Design a protein around this ligand. Sequence first.
Ligand SMILES: *[C@@H]1O[C@H](CO)[C@@H](O[C@@H]2O[C@H](CO)[C@@H](O[C@@H]3O[C@H](CO[C@H]4O[C@H](CO)[C@@H](O)[C@H](O)[C@@H]4O)[C@@H](O)[C@H](O)[C@@H]3O)[C@H](O)[C@H]2NC(C)=O)[C@H](O)[C@H]1NC(C)=O
Ligand SMILES: *[C@@H]1O[C@H](CO)[C@@H](O[C@@H]2O[C@H](CO)[C@@H](O)[C@H](O)[C@H]2NC(C)=O)[C@H](O)[C@H]1NC(C)=O
Ligand SMILES: *[C@@H]1O[C@H](CO)[C@@H](O[C@@H]2O[C@H](CO)[C@@H](O)[C@H](O)[C@H]2NC(C)=O)[C@H](O)[C@H]1NC(C)=O
Ligand SMILES: *[C@@H]1O[C@H](CO)[C@@H](O[C@@H]2O[C@H](CO)[C@@H](O)[C@H](O)[C@H]2NC(C)=O)[C@H](O)[C@H]1NC(C)=O
Ligand SMILES: *[C@@H]1O[C@H](CO)[C@@H](O)[C@H](O)[C@H]1NC(C)=O
Ligand SMILES: *[C@@H]1O[C@H](CO)[C@@H](O)[C@H](O)[C@H]1NC(C)=O
Ligand SMILES: *[C@@H]1O[C@H](CO)[C@@H](O)[C@H](O)[C@H]1NC(C)=O
Ligand SMILES: *[C@@H]1O[C@H](CO)[C@@H](O)[C@H](O)[C@H]1NC(C)=O
Ligand SMILES: *[C@@H]1O[C@H](CO)[C@@H](O)[C@H](O)[C@H]1NC(C)=O
Lengths: 581, 612
Amino acid sequence: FSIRNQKGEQVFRLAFRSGAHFFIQTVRPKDTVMCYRVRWEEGRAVEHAMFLGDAAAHWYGGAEMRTQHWPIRLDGQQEPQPFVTSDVYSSDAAFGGILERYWLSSRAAAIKVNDSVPFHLGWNSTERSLRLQARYHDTPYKPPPELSYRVCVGSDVTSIHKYMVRRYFNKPSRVPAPEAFRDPIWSTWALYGRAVDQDKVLRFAQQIRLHHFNSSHLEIDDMYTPAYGDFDFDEVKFPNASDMFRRLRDAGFRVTLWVHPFVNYNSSRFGEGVERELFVREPTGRLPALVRWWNGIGAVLDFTHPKARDWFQGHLRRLRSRYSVASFKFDAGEVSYLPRDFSTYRPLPDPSVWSRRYTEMALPFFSLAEVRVGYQSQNISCFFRLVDRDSVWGYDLGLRSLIPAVLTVSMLGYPFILPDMVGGNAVPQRTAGGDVPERELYIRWLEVAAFMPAMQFSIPPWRYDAEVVAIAQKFAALRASLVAPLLLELAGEVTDTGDPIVRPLWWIAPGDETAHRIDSQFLIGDTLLVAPVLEPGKQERDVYLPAGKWRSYKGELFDKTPVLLTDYPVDLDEIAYFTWA
Amino acid sequence: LLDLKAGGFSIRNQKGEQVFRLAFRSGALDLDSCSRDGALLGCSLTADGLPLHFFIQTVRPKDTVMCYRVRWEEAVEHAMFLGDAAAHWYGGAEMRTQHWPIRLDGQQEPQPFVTSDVYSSDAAFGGILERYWLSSRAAAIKVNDSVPFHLGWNSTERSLRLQARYHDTPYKPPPELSYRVCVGSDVTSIHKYMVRRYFNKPSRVPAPEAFRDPIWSTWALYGRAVDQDKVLRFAQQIRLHHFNSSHLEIDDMYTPAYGDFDFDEVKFPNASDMFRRLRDAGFRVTLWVHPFVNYNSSRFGEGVERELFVREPTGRLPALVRWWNGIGAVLDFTHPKARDWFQGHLRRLRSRYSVASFKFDAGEVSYLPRDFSTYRPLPDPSVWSRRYTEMALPFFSLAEVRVGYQSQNISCFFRLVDRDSVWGYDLGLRSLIPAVLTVSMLGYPFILPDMVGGNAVPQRTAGGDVPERELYIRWLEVAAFMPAMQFSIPPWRYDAEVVAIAQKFAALRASLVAPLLLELAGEVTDTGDPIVRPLWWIAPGDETAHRIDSQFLIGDTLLVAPVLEPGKQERDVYLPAGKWRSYKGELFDKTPVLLTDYPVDLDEIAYFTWAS
Ligand SMILES: *[C@@H]1O[C@H](CO)[C@@H](O[C@@H]2O[C@H](CO)[C@@H](O[C@@H]3O[C@H](CO[C@H]4O[C@H](CO)[C@@H](O)[C@H](O)[C@@H]4O)[C@@H](O)[C@H](O)[C@@H]3O)[C@H](O)[C@H]2NC(C)=O)[C@H](O)[C@H]1NC(C)=O
Ligand SMILES: *[C@@H]1O[C@H](CO)[C@@H](O[C@@H]2O[C@H](CO)[C@@H](O)[C@H](O)[C@H]2NC(C)=O)[C@H](O)[C@H]1NC(C)=O
Ligand SMILES: *[C@@H]1O[C@H](CO)[C@@H](O[C@@H]2O[C@H](CO)[C@@H](O)[C@H](O)[C@H]2NC(C)=O)[C@H](O)[C@H]1NC(C)=O
Ligand SMILES: *[C@@H]1O[C@H](CO)[C@@H](O[C@@H]2O[C@H](CO)[C@@H](O)[C@H](O)[C@H]2NC(C)=O)[C@H](O)[C@H]1NC(C)=O
Ligand SMILES: *[C@@H]1O[C@H](CO)[C@@H](O)[C@H](O)[C@H]1NC(C)=O
Ligand SMILES: *[C@@H]1O[C@H](CO)[C@@H](O)[C@H](O)[C@H]1NC(C)=O
Ligand SMILES: *[C@@H]1O[C@H](CO)[C@@H](O)[C@H](O)[C@H]1NC(C)=O
Ligand SMILES: *[C@@H]1O[C@H](CO)[C@@H](O)[C@H](O)[C@H]1NC(C)=O
Ligand SMILES: *[C@@H]1O[C@H](CO)[C@@H](O)[C@H](O)[C@H]1NC(C)=O
């Protein structure tokens, strides 16, 4: 079938690919919105092919991906694979920790695949299609096959988007700590890695103050515990944790701790987990299932089990009372780390609801919590971190990935976004510059990061030179005076409007074909327009201003719009931004 | 002599008797689709119209033997009818409730025919089994090793439900139901043909002393709480009461955790000194071992990182398993690294402590996960049980195992699954002869009928703490006539008369039974014949011999008739054709005959030596 709008244009086209209980129910929820409920139910896979269309048609949403484009680009052929929370760090086939079955068109069509579907997603570049599949074979989906979805058609991309988000996604009711929207977060992970210890945390805190930076908080990362699954400090690397936390308090540092859902087989807590039955089980529901993650082999906690939830929460509360820790970084949470076939205390026909149940563990510590997964987690009022970025320039987890990823996550109704580490994680063989991100990549990244809801340093500015430190202090000051006040105001609006903080250009210019295509610019609310340099050896870039009057950061009033500003000057130590007038 | 129809077939012998009948239960044939080319009869279509690879190939391997190869490939089910009351069947699996001949009780949906622990289940199949059924009418069936074979039964129509399926089963693909039905002149000749065709004979013989002197086990006496003091007290008490020993078997638990191989120093302060003392008192010693490593073993981490364990289906991670001693992984005996690793630890215990051999406990695939992967794929999961039994090969002379899956050529002892201190066919005294004969049918000659008096499990013990005095005495007497004899709860736990009865049967075993067991053990390599034989072995045309579950032979010449009922000082004794000299010197030369109310005191067993 195919669908048109009131103006007569074809906005949606779909081919049946399993063959030629089916229904299409038309609904008129508003004078300007037309929705089409669709079902195909016959034991053999259902597949429908959704055509993106004639390249003037641009699409947004779906999953956080390793290679994030905006609008969405289909590369090659992909057989339908489970649309579930996966770790996308090392896979361009899989789908990332934050996703919904939601696709939005610039032609003002949108599709929400029904939550019931055992949903698998593939694609075909040749015919430019999304391959929408329901199946129960070779998949972590369990029965409780049906492909069911709703296609809606509005007047423009922004109105139809707002209708869909208000229909399907819950807004958060609370706001993270104000300081997290202004002062940089400092993380041990990229700087020190696993080898972090009591000396290194204190040296870091000293160096942060010596170079005159504020902190939202200091985040002590992997690894501070004797084994993965233990909750208390390794006394070899942390001789007197209490004294460490006292010193950090004296220097005005709030502190968070890296946590995860795993208990390795050589944790002092593994036996306790087995005997108390706190772990995700093999299919028969009798025994723990072993899992492999990047930090070894063990079990994973069952967050559908009240005993496992209270047990995890108990250890977090103890770290809080013992050390005055503010909150936690909840790492992993993807079901790609659960077994293919598993059982839990409450059955999960949809495995990704496990990811949701993990994100619930942040609720009691939400104010300075971060998670890196979201599956209908929008009403959890903590920060959502993009999956670990690499110290490269490109769309593959690099600098050019930041704006597509942040916008994608914003489309899915998560306002409080943390675009991971300034300069990336500096992984050997995945670092433009060898040991650390090259100076120019670090500077351009820092500048984009200064305009996002939360800013996190690991490799600090003073690792480079005094000019890089000066650039950092400049953008820290600019963030405090211009960006932070707006982020907080927009953060406070979310409860009422459900609108995101970081917005695509097309948000205010929904009928603008150029705004539909832009992946190099973004808005903070409707009034701040940001155009970072995202290419090396460049001291200028083309800047698109949509309809309306815009006052440049230099005081230039642009009142003949829309217009492309060609070779607009932007020095290494500058970012192009424009305020609505 | 085969009669094929749409919905099943039947077979007759040269004399004209129907000796085999089978119904197709996953469909019927289209007979217009059947064509005969010499020996081969092939059919290409079901009655429903489904395409089918079905055939029956007749083979004449000998003047007196006629075989019928059968295949059905499109879940496949055929119902094999046992027939009228006059037709008696033997073989299949060791079972919780063992009858002889085989009795079908109630309705059973086909379930995987795999090595299971039948201690607590009357549905499952035991550690020793083959897909082999033998009829008193001289028909036999061997189900093809290829089949993903599931077995059920139906009492109403008295049928075995033979099923091939790949759904809800530990069988993996590499469904086809394939088998061979053979017909001979008598039950013994057709049995001998089938055993020689399908089962390898062992080429070696266990230590002579194991066929004569009692084995002493710590398990039933002390259980888990066994320690260095208790082993030495036991050894002292064995010598104080003037008994020989094949060996002393130190059982569960002597290690700090399950998966560790060395002695718990809390319970065994100086193991070396313990073994020295046992050597000084002329004790050979064996140690209880198992295929598991619990999660709290000091060897669990080593197993995970070295990938020595049976894995979950994706083949990446160990699969956790539950056994009666806790939760952990199970060693992959298809993996050379896991085999060398296990063998390494056994060799170290040998050189360190001069241990003679090991009791290899568990070994059933009911302790592996439903769905698993191994270093080498096992379409048939029970081959894992076989690979475990191979670990006995280097220590075969005083080794025992309690599983067998084409393990016949491993020249160690095979132990019946743990017996209970009850009288009945449910792992009790009356189970001993059916079980030993069943295991003998499957070509395992060196059989150990577990512990004299059973394992004394609370709530499963006629007598409370220990087996009743009378049950213990009657059991000891029948156990004295089996290939290997094992005490745990010793005679001196009762009274001086029980000790005297033990010394009498120990002496009788040494002078009468042991010389015959050794001679018959030495014959196996040549003849492939078992040691313990059913009455019908020498009397294959004797309808009474076909039915007897209360008597057995040692070879062809020693006939044994124990009392298997409480408060009895007599029993009926059937003597088949030939002359028999009673243990009292009575010549019975008018046979076959039923000896009615034949006197057997509490301290006696009825036995008869061939005199023809
Ligand atoms: C004790 O008894 C065992 C059987 O009860 C003996 O092992 C069996 O021996 C026979 C004859 O050697 C084997 O049958 C053969 O298999 C070989 C090897 O096949 C392998 O490769 C194929 C690849 O196509 C694979 O599918 C198989 O699974 C094997 O990995 C074939 O090449 C021959 O043609 C023939 O079919 C049995 O495989 C084997 N069974 C088991 C369960 O081990 C054992 O040798 C006896 N001991 C002694 C000392 O003789
Ligand atoms: C979306 O999913 C829900 C749940 O699968 C569907 O609602 C069910 O409809 C089935 C049969 O169509 C009924 O048997 C259930 O009782 C319904 N449950 C509820 C909660 O209403 C719904 O129909 C699906 N939408 C479409 C368009 O197929
Ligand atoms: C936060 O949103 C989640 C997800 O929408 C809510 O959980 C769902 O709520 C509905 C309505 O009660 C239930 O029927 C669903 O089963 C829930 N789904 C899951 C995956 O949990 C949750 O209630 C919201 N929180 C609050 C406080 O309203
Ligand atoms: C067990 O065997 C009995 C006897 O053959 C089966 O009962 C008959 O089933 C047939 C086929 O459906 C009916 O036509 C008869 O009327 C049934 N009753 C009789 C003859 O007893 C029974 O189906 C078998 N059950 C199982 C579970 O195999
Ligand atoms: C714990 O186990 C991991 C594998 O899960 C292993 O690599 C590591 O070295 C072990 N470390 C400790 C401290 O036991
Ligand atoms: C640093 O913190 C102080 C105290 O809260 C605040 O007044 C100031 O604006 C901050 N400066 C920054 C972020 O540059
Ligand atoms: C028995 O199995 C083998 C291997 O699958 C097969 O080639 C043979 O034909 C089977 N026998 C019969 C009678 O089907
Ligand atoms: C064990 O006992 C013997 C004799 O008492 C002695 O020679 C040996 O040194 C002892 N060793 C240990 C470690 O107890
Ligand atoms: C014990 O062993 C000796 C010597 O090995 C043997 O001659 C004797 O028959 C055995 N039996 C008894 C009951 O003493």
